[PDB]
Amino acid sequence: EEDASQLIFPKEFETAETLLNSEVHMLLEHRKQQNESAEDEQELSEVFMKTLNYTARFSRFKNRETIASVRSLLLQKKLHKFELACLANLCPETAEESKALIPSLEGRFEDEELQQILDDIQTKRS
Amino acid sequence: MFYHISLEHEILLHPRYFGPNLLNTVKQKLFTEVEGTCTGKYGFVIAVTTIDNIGAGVIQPGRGFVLYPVKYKAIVFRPFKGEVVDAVVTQVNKVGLFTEIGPMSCFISRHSIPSEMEFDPNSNPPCYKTMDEDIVIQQDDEIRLKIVGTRVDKNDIFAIGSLMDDYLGLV
Amino acid sequence: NEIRATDLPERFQLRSIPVKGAEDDELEEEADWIYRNAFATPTISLSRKGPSTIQKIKEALGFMRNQHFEVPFIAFYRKEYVEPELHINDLWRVWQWDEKWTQLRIRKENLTRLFEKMQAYQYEQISAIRALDTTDMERLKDVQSMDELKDVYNHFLLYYGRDIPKKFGLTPEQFGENLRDSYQRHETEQFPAEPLELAKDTPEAVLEGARYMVALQIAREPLVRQVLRQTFQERAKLNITPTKKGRKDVDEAHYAYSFKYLKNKPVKELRDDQFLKICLAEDEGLLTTDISIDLKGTYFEEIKQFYYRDEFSHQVQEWNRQRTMAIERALQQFLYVQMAKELKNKLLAEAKEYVIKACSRKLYNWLRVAPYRPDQQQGKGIRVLGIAFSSARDHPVFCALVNGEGEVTDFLRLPHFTEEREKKAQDIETLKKFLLNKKPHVVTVAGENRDAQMLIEDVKRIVHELDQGQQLSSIGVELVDNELAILYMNSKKSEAEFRDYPPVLRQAVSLARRIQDPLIEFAQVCSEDILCLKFHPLQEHVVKEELLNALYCEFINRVNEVGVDVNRAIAHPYSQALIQYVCGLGPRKGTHLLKILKQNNTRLESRTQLVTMCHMGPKVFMNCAGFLKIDTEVLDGSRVHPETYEWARKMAVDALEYDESAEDANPAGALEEILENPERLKDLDLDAFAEELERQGYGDKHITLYDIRAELSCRYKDLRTAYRSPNTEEIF
The missing domain is CATH 2.40.50.140 (Nucleic acid-binding proteins)
Structure with a gap:
């Protein structure tokens, strides 16, 4: 019944906050920093390792300010929070690509405004 | 896609863990309990990020374990x-x-x-x-x-x- | 029906999978690819020379791709086209060279078609620094450098855009010719502009815009892929030194743990040494491994002066700084990652090749048929009495008396041993009661410990001092190891041949079958049954397909050189299923032959039983004429094919001085007198036979004359070794 294709999600996660690749990358790296210091500790699980090394491949950027920048430039518009991360990680090079991948963008915004949001994300990419 | 949420859980603490290490021990137990696991309700909870509070530990009648409810923020991964x-x-x-x-x-x-x-x-x-x-x-x-x-x-x-x-x- | 009723044989149709046959124009190219690829790191086939090895590879590839020949046929029946008995690996090396040449040709053709299509699209878009279509020919022409062409073609395929509708420093060619020449002949952009002038003509205002394009052009070019390649993989002193946990995690069992302060081991210690490569590959997986050349600090210093400007006045200084920054950006990605990947691939390939060579050597040394026969050769064969005991401690010890024809005759038990703490007469009384009612010919005792050796020695003394070998003779127990009799007893042949007997009777039957017939035990099993025996500790880190192919080729060569009995695979269960490792007849041809001979009552009367009855084809019956042997024509149970029967009969008639009257079966004075002993070898000279074969037969009879003379005089000659009785260290 739930389907991200139509922005329909469980209420317990609709109320939940999506995270970016570079965001969770920084949070996980911060944890790992705490989780390898403070001697007399238990190593992180392999889950944490594979999630780290996954998101490390897909970090568009790294400093918290870059995350805050792409979040702020997105929230000023009228996009739904689900669109916030899928559109912030992939960085589709053209509005046509974003609208083809994301069906909710089709007719959601003028092509030039969606393209501007994309281009801004591109300019934020390290 | 990754997420984070304020979860809550409750631990039963054995009386041996009372005294000065108590709330630290409750924290250690929670990190032992709910890290690195996945759930049919919330999907894959990656880790606790922080503990919102430790509740007042109710002493179970007739058995010495004390039950602490705990509310905690956790990063979680639930694909759709x-x-x-x-x-x-x-x-x-x-x-x-x-x-x-x-x-x-x-x-x-x-x-x-x-x-x-x-x-x-x-x-x-x-x-x-x-x-x-x-x-x-x-x-x-x-x-x-x-x-x-x-x-x-x-x-x-x-x-x-x-x-x-x-x-x-x-x- | 395509493999059993196909025109080509089974083994040649399986070996030429990527290269389906060999044409005329591709035979020289495939032979050159085999001679150039078969010896790069190790001195292999340097025996035959470069010209002789290349002509042997070309002749074997042409014979196999035009005549339906195989690796066994191209070595025995094609000894003139191949190395004349230089090694058993020449046929396998030639087949690998042909397969690699075919695959490289197919890949180069597909890649050249892709490069031509992309160059045509880029030229049509460019006319209606830009994209040129001249690298597609340079990639499709380099079929030998697969690693250099796969790197430049992908870095070129991404460098043109990869679009599918249907001025920064030096150039890539000049930088590649200066870095690979050891002297940088071309400098960077010698212009008055600086990195601020190039960064305001992208839309970022950053000075690092050109360094990314320079790194992408340097890493995706074939000149850097050739210049970096073979410089470190041909020599890299691997500094082996244990890690923080690896010095305690290995404990001197892996390559990084065995030497904690011993570094400077070059690529020969990894590639030529299989144990060092296996330890460096296995210790690196869990804890850590030490694999580093330490020769770049100087390999990276000499490329920094090339492509940079020599002056510094904001014209040559800006160009030299841009060249140095682009070289530093492209070295860590392209050169660093490429050098690491080449070092890792070379280490893995060297460890896998060492493990595969160890496994192939162990399989060739153990696959030789060395049974103990009567007098080291009443009744055929010898009565193998397989004694496979359990413990020697008052439990039932099996002793299976098998005959020499590949079948068990009788079996007995022995529950009395030296159980009872002091029973000296019980084991000897049981041995006398078991040896007195049964006629053996050989003693095959096993061993498990000191008590098993003591029980075997006591039974051998009670049998030799009492005449328990034949009831009127002392028979010595050859005392072989309990290695193959234990594994063949729990197999499907041991379980189908005897289902009521315990493990002791199955072990005794396995020992009696393995102590007198290792070729029927090796050919009667799946190969699954050959991979259960370990051949080396570094074979487990290697790919198992290489060891399986080496074992299958060694077993096929041993079966083709040792002879295949046609009547022994029809009635006896132990002698059947031997038509799987023969030249030209693999699993399908041999299984169809067994089914047709069992269902129709077709017997092995001669070598033309599969050509006359329509069970075999022309190409497999010609390529299998040197492996099929029968019990009875007179040259059918030998290596003489249908085309060599006339020359062999003429040689047998000329060596005896008999009359020529169409001698094919009647001349018993020259055939039955010549097959029993050497009648006259000075009558048949090699020059006369080679002159008669060059004009009547269409082929030189120089290398074939000795085999034609030996097949007419000793039929069914086995290529297995003699009986090795284990003692001392092999017994332990």
Whole structure:
């Protein structure tokens, strides 16, 4: 019944906050920093390792300010929070690509405004 | 896709852990309990990020354990059907393509794969080149996919990817 | 029906999978590819020379791709086209060279078609620094450098855009010719502009815009892929030094743990040494491994002066700084990652090749048929009495008395041993009661410990001092090891041949079958049954397909050189299923022959039983004429094919001075007198036979004359070794 294709999600996660690749990358790296210091500790699980090394491949950027920048430039518009991360990680090079991948963008915004949001994300990419 | 939430849990603490180490011990127990696990309700809880509070520990009548309810923020990963994600090809076989997504993996049959992406079983590296050998898609190639169906298998998830949508390849 | 009723044989149709046959124009190219690829790191086939090895590879590839010949046929029946008995690996090396040449040709053709299509699209888009279509010919022409062409073709395929509708420093060619020449002949952009002038003509205002394009052009070019390649993989002193946890995690069992302060081991210690490569590959997986050349600090210093400007006045200084920054950006990605990947691939390939060579050597040394026969050769064969005991401690010890024809005759038990703490007469009384009612010919005792050796020695003394070998003779127990009799007893042949017997009777039957017939035990099993025996500790880190192919080729060569009995695979269960490792007849041809001979009552009367009855084809019956042997024509149970029967009969008639009257079966004075002993070898000279074969037969009879003379005089000659009785260290 739930389907991200139509922005329909469980209420317990609709109320939940999506995270970016570079965001969770920084949070996980911060944890790992705490989780390898403070001697007399238990190593992180392999889950944490594979999630780290996954998101490390897909970090568009790294400093918290870059995350805050792409979040702020997105929230000023009228996009739904689900669109916030899928559109912030992939960085589709053209509005046509974003609208083809994301069906909710089709007719959601003028092509030039969606393209501007994309281009801004591109300019934020390290 | 990754998330974080204020979860809550309750631990039963044995009386041996009372005294000065108590609330620290409750924390250590919670980190022992709910890290690195996946749930049929919330999906894959990656870790506790912080503890919102430790509740007042009710002493169980007739058995010495004290029950502490605890509220805590945790990062969590719950894929949904319909989501278009970055992934890395892990294994290319004529039976289908296998690919990893965070804690999870997906699998993509030749049925899901465009007809032009023929099998390359005869090369050393398993690939699905096209007939002119221009778009070379092989293992470990950072290939996009769209999660078209979710499945939970005993506190674990196993989605299924596809390649039917355009622009599902190299960036 | 395609493999059993196909025109080509089974083994040649399986070996030429990627290269389906050999044409005329591709035979020289495939032979050159085999001679150039078969010896790169190790001195292999340097025996035959470069010209002789290349002509042997070309002749074997042409014979196999035009005549339906195989690796066994191209070595025995094609000894003139191949190395005349230089090694058993020449046929396998020639087949690998042909397969690699075929695959490289197919890949180069597909890649050249792709490069031509992309160059045509880029030229049509460019006329209606830009994209040129001249690298497609340079990639499709380099079929030998597969690693250099796969790197430049992908970095070129991404460098043109890869679009499918249907001025920064030096150039890539000049930088490649200066870095690969050891002297940088071309400098960077010698212009008055600086990195601020190039960064305001992208839309970022950053000085690092050109360094990314320079790194992408340097890493995706074939000149850098050739210049970096073979410089470190040909020599890299691997500094082995244990890690923080690896010095305690290995404990001197892996390559990084065995030497904690011993570094400077070059690529020969990894590639030529299989144990060092296996330890460096296995210790690196869990804890850590030490694999580093330490020769770049100087390999990276000499390329920094090339492609940079020599002056510094904001014209040559800006160009030299841009060249140095682009070289530093492209070295860490392209050169660093490429050098690491080449070092890792070379280490893995060297460890896998060492493990595969160890496994092939162990399989060739153990696959030789060395049975103990009567007098080291009443009744055929010898009565193998397989004694496979359990413990020697008052439990039932099996002793299976098998005959010499590959079948068990009788069996007995022995529950009395030296159980009872002091029973000296019980074991000897049981041995006398078991040896007195049964007629053996050989003693095959096993061993498990000191008590098993003591029980075997006591039974051998009670049998030799009492005449328990034949009831009127002392028979010595050859005392072989309990290695193959234990594994063949729990198999499908031991379970189908005896299902009521315990493990002791199955072990005794396995020992009696393995102590007198290792070729029927090796050919009667799946190969699954050959991979259960370990051949080396570094074979487990190697790919198993290489060891399986080496074992299958060694077993096929041993079966082709040792002879295949046609009547022994029809009635006896132990002698059947031997038509799987023969030249030209693999699993399908041999299984169809067994089914047709069992269902129709077709017996092995001669070598033309599969050509006359329509069970075999022309190409497999010609390529299998040197492996099929029968019990009875007179040259059918030998290596003489249908085309060599006339020359062999003429040689047998000329060596005896008999009359020529169409001698094919009647001349018993020249055939039955010549097959029993050497009648006259000075009558048949090699020059006369080679002159008669060059004009009547269409082929030189120089290398074939000795085999034609030996097949007419000793039929069914086995290529297995003699009986090795284990003692001392092999007994332990």
